[PDB]
Amino acid sequence: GSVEKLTADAELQRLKNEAAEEAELERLKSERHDHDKKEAERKALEDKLADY
């Protein structure tokens, strides 16, 4: 197995990345940059609370 703990989160981000990969890749790369910094705030308590 692999790290599939954030299956829903990864899927959402992937679907967005795939859709934006067309031409909005420039925006996608910037959006993820500002969103991942927020992920550190969410995943901090999220990953801690969620055991599985």
Binding site: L25, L28, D36
Partner: protein
């Protein structure tokens, strides 16, 4: 090569091709074409124009300053501190 280096970069440095695989925190950078368990969609093949190779710090977003992914699960990506020109 030497201990006391003297150089400068152009603002953000989106055209930075310098060789460095460490963050400003002295953390080891992960290879762009690697497959450690990370969450990302930055495939080098998607941005061949930014010359993403090995585990060298790059900036495909053209943001404030170059960054890179870390090989430490405690961190995702960190920025790199490089001396920039005054003007």
């Amino acid at each position: 090569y030497v201990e006391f280096s003297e150089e400068c970069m152009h603002g953000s440095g989106e055209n930075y091709d310098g060789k460095i695989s460490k963050t400003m925190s002295g953390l080891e950078c992960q290879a762009w074409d690697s497959q450690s368990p990370h969450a990302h969609g930055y495939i080098p093949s998607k941005f061949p124009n930014k010359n993403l190779k090995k585990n060298y710090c790059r900036n495909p977003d053209r943001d404030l300053r170059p960054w890179c992914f870390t090989t430490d699960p405690n961190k995702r990506w960190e920025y790199c501190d490089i001396p920039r020109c005054a003007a």
